[PDB]
Amino acid sequence: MFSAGHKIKGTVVLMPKNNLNAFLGRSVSLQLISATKADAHGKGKVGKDTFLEGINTSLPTLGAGESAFNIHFEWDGSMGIPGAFYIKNYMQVEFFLKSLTLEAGTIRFVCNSWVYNTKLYKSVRIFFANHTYVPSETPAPLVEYREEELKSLRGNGTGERKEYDRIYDYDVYNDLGNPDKSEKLARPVLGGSSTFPYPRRGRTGRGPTVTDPNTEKQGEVFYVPRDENLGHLKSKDALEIGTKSLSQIVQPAFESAFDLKSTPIEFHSFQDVHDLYEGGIKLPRDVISTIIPLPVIKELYRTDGQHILKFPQPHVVQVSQSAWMTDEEFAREMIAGVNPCVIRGLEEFPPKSNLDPAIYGDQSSKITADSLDLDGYTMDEALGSRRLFMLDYHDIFMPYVRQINQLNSAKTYATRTILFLREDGTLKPVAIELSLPHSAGDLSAAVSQVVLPAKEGVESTIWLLAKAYVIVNDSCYHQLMSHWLNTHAAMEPFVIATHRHLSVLHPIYKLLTPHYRNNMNINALARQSLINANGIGETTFLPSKYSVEMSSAVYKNWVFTDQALPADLIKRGVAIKDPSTPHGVRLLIEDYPYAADGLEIWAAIKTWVQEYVPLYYARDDDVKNDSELQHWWKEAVEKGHGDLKDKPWWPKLQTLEDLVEVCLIIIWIASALHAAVNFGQYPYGGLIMNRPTASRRLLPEKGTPEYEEMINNHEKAYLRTITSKLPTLISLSVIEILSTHASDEVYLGQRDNPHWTSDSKALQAFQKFGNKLKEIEEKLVRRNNDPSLQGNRLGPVQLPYTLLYPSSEEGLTFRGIPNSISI
Ligand SMILES: [Fe+3]
């Protein structure tokens, strides 16, 4: 090397898959690539292959599991400034590359990527320094490298994907059915048709089943691009794999305990349910022994290691075990519960249906105004003052009621619940309509009916059951639409488009990708065990084999721009546009905790996106002229959500406003919307009576033993109506996992690396965002401490609404907003 040359001092930080000397010698080579000096073909000049020289044991700052290595690079001649590097792993086993740092002012590369043996790769792995560039700002010597890496990530739409592949592409949901196992397990393909529109998911390419060329074959592992499944230092944090263990290992063990009549088959009283988190449930030794060693699963229950499993006490009963049964809590949960985003204003009376009466029978509501306890208000007054609301599941469920009720052990109604907003600011339920389709060719004599509030006699039991029917509709809509379709499924197309079309160098890549963490991974695992034919979802929720297809019916009406919180509130008639207020909308239910708190988070995110975007885009033309951005949005819409590609409401993305709106909505769905619908699942639903997932019979007729049971044993009437004990144990277990924050969660206002960009302005903006979120949390604390807001923020269950607190410790905390759909 040159006599007065100075080698560049480098430090490589990596984590071995599972000593360290093995990484020395000729094990791992790096080659720096210049960002500023090019060869005759305009490509950045490449340095010599350089191997790790030794272990650096001097750096006190390293995360757990991390090791640092010294490396020095020759850089003589006009090599300019390094902006990327190639790395080749000659070892048999992959390692996780954390970072390269070049000293002497400092150049940082944030890699966080598995590097497999070099022979497995068609292209040498390339990593860029942490500088951010829109394509027109890419240093000329890196332009081809930047595009070639995107081409690598896209692949060619063919081939069976392997573990170490980093290939992002789309496919339809044709991998849920198991037609090769049984024709009973065949399911319609979701996506790619007018009958069944659906967001796309990540392509896996396992090829067709033997029986159906349109259904993808089963697989032991559902591929995701390698770095979408990064791994966890502590197995307890691999919550997503628990779902797989639950379906494949734990569910069969529970099933056996029932098959062997080792525990009563049904609950017989409410106390048999409360027992689950008090003394626990006694099960055969082999069930316990099957559970205890399993990572994640072992955390779900306390045990004596012999026969007892105890579930954790759900938040909803921590103060009052009977408060869930109150009409006040039933209504309050529509605004501060697990599914707080379906209630709508009702602006005429009676409520109307759009459904065809030729098919379903007369659809006129039978609810009478005179029957309603509106605290002295007339109907005209209640409508005029915007005090009438409804939870309207009539049109949503009616088209499915006949087929659901044909199933053994499922019976449902299409319900509507009328709520009145009292002057005291709380909601009260005033009627429930339990509707069934009726046509000339009907065998069933069951009738639709209206049920009114009652505290005494059989009528109180009928009303309690009516609430349960409502909540079964609500639980199904929550799990399949509010949660699954609107978060998990709707976001995946954006994750794929982002990796395919926005370089790691791209500002919008850096802005959005933290909000994707673990999403493809949980979704893949969900396709394999949760929403698959005969999987957890179908065996625990009312619609059974019709569940995921009902979500395609609802996706027909999915509107991207209506996912924006203000647009949602206005659309549902629970708020009105109001420029004189800070959020720009006035809530019609003033103390609506999800909406009130959500507006604060929404505004914080908006401010962050509005500060970040101008750092990279000066004018609308800059957005129009970004070919990566244009390709990204064109593909996300025309391929990722392609069944809806023609809808008039898609932003065109030719303006700054559009880019802000699109990023904001993506970040909102991934972080706060998902947190709000996800982390309350066990807190509210851990008591099955409060959130029944299924109903198994219609209301009994007078003159039958079932009717007499309502009089003599209302708890048993109730328990015979809702989800059976066995699916209850399985359901509770899955919602417990899903309600748990892993200790390595990255929350809103956090990033995994302080050096994700070298752009100090972006880093500053991000710090302000985090500071704002802390300020918001103090605010939400004060709200929960405000005695005037007790009625809606705490309710008779005395459960402070903390779901939109930004921060949380690990565990089942009922608070904390992750950056992404990470569980
Ligand atoms: Fe989730």
PDB file of N, CA, C and O in Angstrom, residues 246-286:
ATOM      1  N   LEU A 246     -49.786 -23.519  19.921  1.00  0.00           N
ATOM      2  CA  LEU A 246     -51.148 -23.698  20.360  1.00  0.00           C
ATOM      3  C   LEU A 246     -51.971 -24.584  19.429  1.00  0.00           C
ATOM      4  O   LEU A 246     -52.614 -25.518  19.885  1.00  0.00           O
ATOM      5  N   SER A 247     -51.934 -24.320  18.121  1.00  0.00           N
ATOM      6  CA  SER A 247     -52.717 -25.118  17.193  1.00  0.00           C
ATOM      7  C   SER A 247     -52.185 -26.538  17.080  1.00  0.00           C
ATOM      8  O   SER A 247     -52.957 -27.488  17.077  1.00  0.00           O
ATOM      9  N   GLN A 248     -50.860 -26.678  17.037  1.00  0.00           N
ATOM     10  CA  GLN A 248     -50.262 -27.973  16.691  1.00  0.00           C
ATOM     11  C   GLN A 248     -49.994 -28.897  17.874  1.00  0.00           C
ATOM     12  O   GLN A 248     -49.915 -30.117  17.698  1.00  0.00           O
ATOM     13  N   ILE A 249     -49.792 -28.319  19.053  1.00  0.00           N
ATOM     14  CA  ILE A 249     -49.414 -29.105  20.241  1.00  0.00           C
ATOM     15  C   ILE A 249     -50.445 -28.966  21.367  1.00  0.00           C
ATOM     16  O   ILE A 249     -50.891 -29.963  21.954  1.00  0.00           O
ATOM     17  N   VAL A 250     -50.813 -27.740  21.704  1.00  0.00           N
ATOM     18  CA  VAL A 250     -51.616 -27.552  22.918  1.00  0.00           C
ATOM     19  C   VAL A 250     -53.087 -27.919  22.675  1.00  0.00           C
ATOM     20  O   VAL A 250     -53.706 -28.621  23.474  1.00  0.00           O
ATOM     21  N   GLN A 251     -53.632 -27.473  21.562  1.00  0.00           N
ATOM     22  CA  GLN A 251     -55.025 -27.797  21.255  1.00  0.00           C
ATOM     23  C   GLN A 251     -55.315 -29.297  21.269  1.00  0.00           C
ATOM     24  O   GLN A 251     -56.298 -29.701  21.878  1.00  0.00           O
ATOM     25  N   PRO A 252     -54.475 -30.141  20.612  1.00  0.00           N
ATOM     26  CA  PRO A 252     -54.708 -31.597  20.699  1.00  0.00           C
ATOM     27  C   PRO A 252     -54.665 -32.123  22.140  1.00  0.00           C
ATOM     28  O   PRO A 252     -55.431 -33.029  22.484  1.00  0.00           O
ATOM     29  N   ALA A 253     -53.793 -31.551  22.977  1.00  0.00           N
ATOM     30  CA  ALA A 253     -53.703 -31.973  24.375  1.00  0.00           C
ATOM     31  C   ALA A 253     -54.990 -31.613  25.153  1.00  0.00           C
ATOM     32  O   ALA A 253     -55.531 -32.460  25.854  1.00  0.00           O
ATOM     33  N   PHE A 254     -55.475 -30.382  25.010  1.00  0.00           N
ATOM     34  CA  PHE A 254     -56.793 -30.029  25.574  1.00  0.00           C
ATOM     35  C   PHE A 254     -57.855 -30.975  25.062  1.00  0.00           C
ATOM     36  O   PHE A 254     -58.662 -31.503  25.838  1.00  0.00           O
ATOM     37  N   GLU A 255     -57.880 -31.173  23.745  1.00  0.00           N
ATOM     38  CA  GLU A 255     -58.924 -32.033  23.153  1.00  0.00           C
ATOM     39  C   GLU A 255     -58.944 -33.405  23.813  1.00  0.00           C
ATOM     40  O   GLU A 255     -60.014 -33.940  24.117  1.00  0.00           O
ATOM     41  N   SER A 256     -57.764 -33.978  24.022  1.00  0.00           N
ATOM     42  CA  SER A 256     -57.662 -35.290  24.632  1.00  0.00           C
ATOM     43  C   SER A 256     -58.276 -35.288  26.037  1.00  0.00           C
ATOM     44  O   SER A 256     -59.049 -36.187  26.380  1.00  0.00           O
ATOM     45  N   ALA A 257     -57.974 -34.255  26.826  1.00  0.00           N
ATOM     46  CA  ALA A 257     -58.495 -34.167  28.200  1.00  0.00           C
ATOM     47  C   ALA A 257     -60.004 -34.229  28.202  1.00  0.00           C
ATOM     48  O   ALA A 257     -60.593 -34.808  29.099  1.00  0.00           O
ATOM     49  N   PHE A 258     -60.633 -33.649  27.183  1.00  0.00           N
ATOM     50  CA  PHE A 258     -62.095 -33.697  27.089  1.00  0.00           C
ATOM     51  C   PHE A 258     -62.564 -35.045  26.571  1.00  0.00           C
ATOM     52  O   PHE A 258     -63.519 -35.617  27.110  1.00  0.00           O
ATOM     53  N   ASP A 259     -61.875 -35.541  25.547  1.00  0.00           N
ATOM     54  CA  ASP A 259     -62.223 -36.856  24.972  1.00  0.00           C
ATOM     55  C   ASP A 259     -62.196 -37.940  26.067  1.00  0.00           C
ATOM     56  O   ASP A 259     -63.034 -38.876  26.091  1.00  0.00           O
ATOM     57  N   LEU A 260     -61.245 -37.808  26.984  1.00  0.00           N
ATOM     58  CA  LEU A 260     -61.105 -38.772  28.096  1.00  0.00           C
ATOM     59  C   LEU A 260     -61.975 -38.479  29.305  1.00  0.00           C
ATOM     60  O   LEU A 260     -61.845 -39.159  30.343  1.00  0.00           O
ATOM     61  N   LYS A 261     -62.832 -37.461  29.177  1.00  0.00           N
ATOM     62  CA  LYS A 261     -63.784 -37.065  30.211  1.00  0.00           C
ATOM     63  C   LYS A 261     -63.083 -36.812  31.548  1.00  0.00           C
ATOM     64  O   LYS A 261     -63.585 -37.187  32.617  1.00  0.00           O
ATOM     65  N   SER A 262     -61.937 -36.123  31.467  1.00  0.00           N
ATOM     66  CA  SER A 262     -61.127 -35.816  32.641  1.00  0.00           C
ATOM     67  C   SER A 262     -61.552 -34.514  33.320  1.00  0.00           C
ATOM     68  O   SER A 262     -61.128 -34.233  34.431  1.00  0.00           O
ATOM     69  N   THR A 263     -62.394 -33.734  32.635  1.00  0.00           N
ATOM     70  CA  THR A 263     -62.866 -32.455  33.144  1.00  0.00           C
ATOM     71  C   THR A 263     -64.298 -32.288  32.610  1.00  0.00           C
ATOM     72  O   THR A 263     -64.615 -32.889  31.590  1.00  0.00           O
ATOM     73  N   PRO A 264     -65.160 -31.551  33.317  1.00  0.00           N
ATOM     74  CA  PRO A 264     -66.528 -31.450  32.766  1.00  0.00           C
ATOM     75  C   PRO A 264     -66.483 -30.869  31.362  1.00  0.00           C
ATOM     76  O   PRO A 264     -65.623 -30.000  31.059  1.00  0.00           O
ATOM     77  N   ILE A 265     -67.411 -31.310  30.514  1.00  0.00           N
ATOM     78  CA  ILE A 265     -67.356 -30.882  29.115  1.00  0.00           C
ATOM     79  C   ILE A 265     -67.804 -29.446  28.990  1.00  0.00           C
ATOM     80  O   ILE A 265     -67.346 -28.709  28.099  1.00  0.00           O
ATOM     81  N   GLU A 266     -68.750 -29.062  29.834  1.00  0.00           N
ATOM     82  CA  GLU A 266     -69.310 -27.705  29.729  1.00  0.00           C
ATOM     83  C   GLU A 266     -69.112 -27.009  31.063  1.00  0.00           C
ATOM     84  O   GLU A 266     -69.022 -27.660  32.134  1.00  0.00           O
ATOM     85  N   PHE A 267     -69.087 -25.688  31.014  1.00  0.00           N
ATOM     86  CA  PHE A 267     -69.214 -24.916  32.237  1.00  0.00           C
ATOM     87  C   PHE A 267     -70.657 -25.067  32.767  1.00  0.00           C
ATOM     88  O   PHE A 267     -71.620 -25.055  31.979  1.00  0.00           O
ATOM     89  N   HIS A 268     -70.807 -25.165  34.087  1.00  0.00           N
ATOM     90  CA  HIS A 268     -72.167 -25.252  34.647  1.00  0.00           C
ATOM     91  C   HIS A 268     -72.679 -24.059  35.389  1.00  0.00           C
ATOM     92  O   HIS A 268     -73.887 -23.936  35.611  1.00  0.00           O
ATOM     93  N   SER A 269     -71.756 -23.172  35.748  1.00  0.00           N
ATOM     94  CA  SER A 269     -72.077 -21.940  36.394  1.00  0.00           C
ATOM     95  C   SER A 269     -71.012 -20.903  36.021  1.00  0.00           C
ATOM     96  O   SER A 269     -69.917 -21.231  35.544  1.00  0.00           O
ATOM     97  N   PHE A 270     -71.316 -19.645  36.263  1.00  0.00           N
ATOM     98  CA  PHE A 270     -70.307 -18.614  36.068  1.00  0.00           C
ATOM     99  C   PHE A 270     -69.050 -18.837  36.906  1.00  0.00           C
ATOM    100  O   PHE A 270     -67.931 -18.561  36.458  1.00  0.00           O
ATOM    101  N   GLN A 271     -69.226 -19.393  38.108  1.00  0.00           N
ATOM    102  CA  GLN A 271     -68.058 -19.623  38.965  1.00  0.00           C
ATOM    103  C   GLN A 271     -67.080 -20.640  38.345  1.00  0.00           C
ATOM    104  O   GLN A 271     -65.896 -20.549  38.573  1.00  0.00           O
ATOM    105  N   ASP A 272     -67.583 -21.590  37.541  1.00  0.00           N
ATOM    106  CA  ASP A 272     -66.702 -22.563  36.869  1.00  0.00           C
ATOM    107  C   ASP A 272     -65.794 -21.802  35.899  1.00  0.00           C
ATOM    108  O   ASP A 272     -64.653 -22.236  35.651  1.00  0.00           O
ATOM    109  N   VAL A 273     -66.288 -20.686  35.354  1.00  0.00           N
ATOM    110  CA  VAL A 273     -65.444 -19.814  34.518  1.00  0.00           C
ATOM    111  C   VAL A 273     -64.450 -19.013  35.353  1.00  0.00           C
ATOM    112  O   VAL A 273     -63.272 -18.964  35.024  1.00  0.00           O
ATOM    113  N   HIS A 274     -64.933 -18.385  36.424  1.00  0.00           N
ATOM    114  CA  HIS A 274     -64.035 -17.634  37.297  1.00  0.00           C
ATOM    115  C   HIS A 274     -62.925 -18.535  37.859  1.00  0.00           C
ATOM    116  O   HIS A 274     -61.818 -18.081  38.107  1.00  0.00           O
ATOM    117  N   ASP A 275     -63.245 -19.807  38.083  1.00  0.00           N
ATOM    118  CA  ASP A 275     -62.258 -20.735  38.629  1.00  0.00           C
ATOM    119  C   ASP A 275     -61.003 -20.720  37.761  1.00  0.00           C
ATOM    120  O   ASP A 275     -59.909 -20.905  38.275  1.00  0.00           O
ATOM    121  N   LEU A 276     -61.136 -20.524  36.435  1.00  0.00           N
ATOM    122  CA  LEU A 276     -59.955 -20.648  35.556  1.00  0.00           C
ATOM    123  C   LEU A 276     -58.796 -19.761  35.963  1.00  0.00           C
ATOM    124  O   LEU A 276     -57.647 -20.162  35.760  1.00  0.00           O
ATOM    125  N   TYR A 277     -59.089 -18.594  36.551  1.00  0.00           N
ATOM    126  CA  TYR A 277     -58.021 -17.675  36.974  1.00  0.00           C
ATOM    127  C   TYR A 277     -57.952 -17.546  38.494  1.00  0.00           C
ATOM    128  O   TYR A 277     -57.226 -16.692  38.995  1.00  0.00           O
ATOM    129  N   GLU A 278     -58.637 -18.425  39.214  1.00  0.00           N
ATOM    130  CA  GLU A 278     -58.589 -18.442  40.695  1.00  0.00           C
ATOM    131  C   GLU A 278     -57.848 -19.709  41.100  1.00  0.00           C
ATOM    132  O   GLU A 278     -56.629 -19.721  41.083  1.00  0.00           O
ATOM    133  N   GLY A 279     -58.559 -20.785  41.384  1.00  0.00           N
ATOM    134  CA  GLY A 279     -57.904 -22.041  41.699  1.00  0.00           C
ATOM    135  C   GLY A 279     -57.289 -22.723  40.500  1.00  0.00           C
ATOM    136  O   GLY A 279     -56.404 -23.571  40.647  1.00  0.00           O
ATOM    137  N   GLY A 280     -57.825 -22.410  39.323  1.00  0.00           N
ATOM    138  CA  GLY A 280     -57.372 -22.949  38.048  1.00  0.00           C
ATOM    139  C   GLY A 280     -58.232 -24.090  37.621  1.00  0.00           C
ATOM    140  O   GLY A 280     -59.349 -24.273  38.134  1.00  0.00           O
ATOM    141  N   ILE A 281     -57.728 -24.828  36.644  1.00  0.00           N
ATOM    142  CA  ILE A 281     -58.417 -26.038  36.144  1.00  0.00           C
ATOM    143  C   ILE A 281     -57.469 -27.205  36.299  1.00  0.00           C
ATOM    144  O   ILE A 281     -56.275 -27.093  36.014  1.00  0.00           O
ATOM    145  N   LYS A 282     -58.023 -28.310  36.770  1.00  0.00           N
ATOM    146  CA  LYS A 282     -57.255 -29.536  36.962  1.00  0.00           C
ATOM    147  C   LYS A 282     -57.339 -30.287  35.627  1.00  0.00           C
ATOM    148  O   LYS A 282     -58.437 -30.481  35.062  1.00  0.00           O
ATOM    149  N   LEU A 283     -56.179 -30.674  35.122  1.00  0.00           N
ATOM    150  CA  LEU A 283     -56.089 -31.430  33.865  1.00  0.00           C
ATOM    151  C   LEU A 283     -55.165 -32.636  34.042  1.00  0.00           C
ATOM    152  O   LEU A 283     -54.408 -32.718  35.027  1.00  0.00           O
ATOM    153  N   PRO A 284     -55.219 -33.592  33.093  1.00  0.00           N
ATOM    154  CA  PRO A 284     -54.391 -34.772  33.230  1.00  0.00           C
ATOM    155  C   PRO A 284     -52.929 -34.372  33.241  1.00  0.00           C
ATOM    156  O   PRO A 284     -52.567 -33.386  32.611  1.00  0.00           O
ATOM    157  N   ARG A 285     -52.123 -35.100  33.987  1.00  0.00           N
ATOM    158  CA  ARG A 285     -50.686 -34.837  34.013  1.00  0.00           C
ATOM    159  C   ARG A 285     -50.084 -34.597  32.616  1.00  0.00           C
ATOM    160  O   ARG A 285     -49.329 -33.656  32.414  1.00  0.00           O
ATOM    161  N   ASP A 286     -50.431 -35.436  31.643  1.00  0.00           N
ATOM    162  CA  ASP A 286     -49.877 -35.294  30.279  1.00  0.00           C
ATOM    163  C   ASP A 286     -50.195 -33.988  29.561  1.00  0.00           C
ATOM    164  O   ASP A 286     -49.404 -33.531  28.722  1.00  0.00           O
TER     165      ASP A 286
END
